[PDB]
């Protein structure tokens, strides 16, 4: 039971979310590249760089984002980059792959210059995400909400927390239609947003590690991740 201004909004969010492709040239490296900390770090860079290019495209095709302040427009984007990437990584990671393709993935994630003290909470988050059995619509909406977060140095807030509002209201209605058995679903979804936010500290810690140990990032990533 969605309203018409809700189905249109949803259809909009879904239209931009389904544009997010990942060139076969980059992904094919997972199945063809050599197993070494460098080649795996190389994959992460190319992927996370394409992700930012596509996330900006998803962000501006958002309803009302373009009707915002050029410093609030870029405030939000700069701020959601890390969260949105790990959320996308959790979504992909949680897809049913064929025989030992998930083991291959997990092996690469490990040998990519990240110390396990972060890897452990990473997989901890992925399983928790996997447990919620999230639909396509919930990932897209969750992504829109993580971007439209009037929190952490945009000046306005009220306007930011006006576009995000019907989004959450749509995310709620969705939780009842598809998971009416579990009425804690909505609370649990927002719950993963909290665990998601904690990734900025861990990400900063891993950044310096690759940094001090001679691992280079693309100029776009240097702007987004602050290097």
């Amino acid at each position: 039971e969605l309203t018409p201004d809700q189905q249109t909004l949803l259809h909009f969010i879904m239209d931009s979310y389904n544009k997010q492709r990942m060139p076969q040239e980059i992904t094919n490296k997972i199945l063809k590249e050599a197993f070494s900390a460098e080649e795996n770090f190389l994959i992460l860079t190319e992927m996370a760089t394409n992700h930012v290019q596509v996330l900006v495209e998803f962000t501006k095709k958002l309803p009302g984002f373009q009707t915002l302040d050029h410093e609030d427009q870029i405030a939000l984007l700069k701020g959601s980059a890390v969260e949105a990437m790990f959320l996308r990584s959790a979504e992909i990671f949680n897809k049913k792959l064929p025989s030992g393709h998930s083991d291959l993935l997990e092996a690469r994630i490990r040998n990519s210059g990240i110390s396990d003290e972060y890897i452990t909470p990473m997989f901890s988050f992925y399983k928790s995400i996997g447990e919620l059995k999230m639909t396509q619509e919930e990932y897209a909406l969750l992504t829109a909400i993580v971007i439209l977060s009037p929190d952490r140095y945009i000046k306005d807030r009220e306007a930011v927390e006006k576009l995000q509002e019907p989004l959450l209201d749509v995310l709620q209605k969705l939780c009842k239609i598809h998971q009416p058995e579990n009425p804690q679903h909505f609370a649990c979804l927002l719950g993963r947003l909290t665990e998601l936010r904690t990734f900025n500290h861990h990400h900063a810690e891993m950044l310096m590690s690759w940094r001090v140990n001679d691992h280079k990032f693309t100029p776009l990533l240097c702007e987004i991740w602050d290097v």
């Binding site: 900006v56 501006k60 870029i74 984007l77 776009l220 702007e223």
Partner: peptide, 10 residues
């Protein structure tokens, strides 16, 4: 900076 504003505008 340069790249982000660029991607946003064009």
């Amino acid at each position: 900076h340069q790249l982000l504003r660029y991607l946003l505008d064009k």
